Design a protein around this ligand. Structure first.
Ligand SMILES: Nc1ncnc2c1ncn2[C@@H]1O[C@H](COP(=O)(O)OP(=O)(O)OP(O)(O)=S)[C@@H](O)[C@H]1O
Ligand SMILES: Nc1ncnc2c1ncn2[C@@H]1O[C@H](COP(=O)(O)OP(=O)(O)OP(O)(O)=S)[C@@H](O)[C@H]1O
Lengths: 8, 350, 350
């Protein structure tokens, strides 16, 4: 549904 | 008849101590909420305005305590939600609409009784933007939550699954222009922002002033000078703060206040432990010489009223560990020395 | 209906743990008092009875995780061991705080009234302690955010859990005001921050005193002097520490303590290898001269009790490799020289 993709 | 600010405040004083300005704001709001709904569709001054509340104070000041104690005396429905679990634009977490759904559980699906309810939110600081400028990338637990609440606070239609459903085929409409919202949260780091704005020194030379170490920016006196512009640098959006005109500035727990919190309230820790040993056939005592000494230890922790159990349980650890094994024990006395750790609590046998 | 006492439960944990008299007292008082708050059914004058969580702190391999494991055996009420390394701020892909609750219900057979009185344990809590300045630039999904989410879980709230994950789109509400939490994780680097508070000086000047190694702080003693303000520098939030007033500091292993770990506990490594060869029809022995040498080698590794198998298995590698092929061997003796490696372990023939 919702993708929480984050990279430091 | 209806209650009054003096009567509702007298009730909260039994459960809360040392918060004068905070009790006044909630009393006027609750006292005014009955007036707005009662005058709805009967007063010529139609489209009555609304005024939400934004509580602010240090940790362990009594924010979450006021919401619980208020439900005891409040007649209309009340709920206790949290900002941290909300998610904007229908993501993995719960949606804004879930807040209204929890209200119907306590209201028994009474829409006419749900619109006149009150709502409370805790830990509002968790959704604040980390930086002053808007985040370049999308945020799931920040600014976006504020955006979805704008139309909610002002007033908007909502979707609520009546029974046995999460999403789409039965929706109950519930307006929100008259629903009250009580947001609260201990904003961390706000003292640094106000100092730059208020002190304005920011210098090293002769003409620039260098405030003497440890005699400045007192949290109690600093929050009083707060303004909406200060929260913008914190991360909140002006559109969100505009929905909450009222602001309440609390104070840090005074040394004298902690002594009263353990004696005057009914749910004090001293009364709690007294009941813990009452079933054990053992009494308890707490002399004034020990209370005043505990206040200096608690304030050093800078944690608030909730950091008091560490001082008590650390002292009564040995005593509680051995009291059940002991027999013919009818009363326990804890003098001031016991708190410092240089002595052992005196025991009285039958 | 006679409940156990601290002296009785301490005898059980003493069989599995050694040299943790300070930590065992805390778990005994909490478990003891937990049944008292549970026993009450709102039939006492005291209301809103207090809660007291526990925060275990100790070196690596000192036995923190072992205390929680052995505790669940003798414990009647349910118990869990939820890893906190994988926890993520609610609203993100990685994980939610709710997952912890779901585990508790599997142990209690989905008994809400029986799960509310359960116990919860968390490991590796230092993994979420963010070490940084105020994070204006970025938002942490596993650091500061996770700790804030936990605050709502504690002190009282209502959450949502699927019915075994869902065969319905419905959830069950379970209060958590009465649920106890025992968070514990070896905080690495906590000694350096405490030293600044206790040493009080750099000592590059003429007047300032300098004791670089004569008065150097001992790690064991130093943790005893911990306080909540010290943890704020480490990364923890004051709001998080206020929920955990009690603190338990554990001492490092000692040469004398290591010898008792191999003999008194039933789950000792010495007894493990004794049973490993019992099925093979061979006896095992361990003389005291070998234990004293093993203790010195383990302390140098700076790993604790967990760094003991490397000393044993590295020595008995050659012996175990050719033990099955050998015949008529009924007993084995390990001398001090065997640990040093100068000689080989003597073998006996039946
Ligand atoms: N004014 C007060 N009078 C008496 N006890 C208080 C008061 N304020 C706090 N306490 C004590 O502190 C406990 C916790 O109070 P809270 O309302 O949770 O403080 P808090 O500021 O809301 O914490 P937050 O918002 O999660 S940082 C209460 O259960 C009381 O025991
Ligand atoms: N007091 C003790 N007596 C006997 N064995 C112990 C003791 N403490 C630790 N051990 C051994 O160490 C193993 C692991 O102990 P742990 O509880 O994991 O230590 P720890 O402090 O939890 O390390 P962390 O926190 O997981 S890094 C146990 O399975 C035992 O074999």
């Amino acid at each position: 549904x919702x993708x929480x993709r984050x990279x430091x | 008849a209806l209650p009054t600010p003096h009567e509702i405040r007298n009730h909260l004083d039994d459960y809360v101590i040392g918060q004068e300005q905070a009790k006044k704001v909630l009393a006027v709001a609750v006292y005014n909420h009955y007036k707005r709904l009662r005058n709805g569709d009967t007063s010529n001054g139609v489209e009555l305005g609304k005024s939400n509340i934004l509580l602010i104070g240090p940790t362990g000041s009594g924010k979450t305590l006021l919401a619980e104690t208020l439900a005891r005396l409040l007649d209309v429905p009340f709920t206790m939600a949290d900002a941290t679990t909300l998610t904007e634009a229908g993501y993995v977490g719960e949606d804004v609409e879930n807040i209204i759904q929890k209200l119907l559980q306590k209201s028994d699906y009474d829409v006419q009784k749900a619109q006149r309810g009150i709502v409370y939110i805790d830990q509002i600081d968790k959704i604040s933007r980390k930086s002053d400028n808007p985040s370049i990338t999308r945020d799931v637990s920040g600014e976006g939550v504020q955006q979805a609440l704008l139309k909610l606070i002002e007033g908007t239609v909502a979707a609520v699954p009546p029974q046995g459903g999460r999403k789409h085929q039965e929706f109950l409409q519930v307006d929100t222009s008259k629903i009250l919202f009580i947001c609260g949260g201990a904003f961390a780091g706000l003292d640094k922002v106000i100092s730059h704005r208020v002190e304005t020194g920011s210098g090293i030379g002769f003409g620039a002033t260098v405030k003497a170490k440890s005699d400045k920016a007192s949290e109690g006196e600093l929050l009083a000078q707060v303004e909406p512009e200060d929260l913008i640098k914190f991360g909140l959006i002006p559109e969100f703060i505009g929905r909450l005109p009222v602001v309440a500035t609390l104070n840090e727990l005074s040394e004298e206040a902690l002594i009263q919190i353990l004696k005057e309230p009914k749910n004090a820790l001293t009364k709690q432990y007294q009941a813990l040993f009452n079933l054990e056939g053992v009494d308890l005592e707490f002399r004034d010489e020990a209370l005043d000494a505990i206040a200096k230890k608690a304030m050093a922790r800078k944690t608030g009223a909730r950091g008091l159990r560490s001082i008590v349980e650390a002292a009564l650890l040995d005593t509680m560990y051995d009291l059940p094994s002991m027999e013919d024990v009818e009363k326990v006395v804890i003098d001031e020395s016991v708190i410092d750790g240089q002595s052992e609590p005196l025991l009285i046998y039958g």
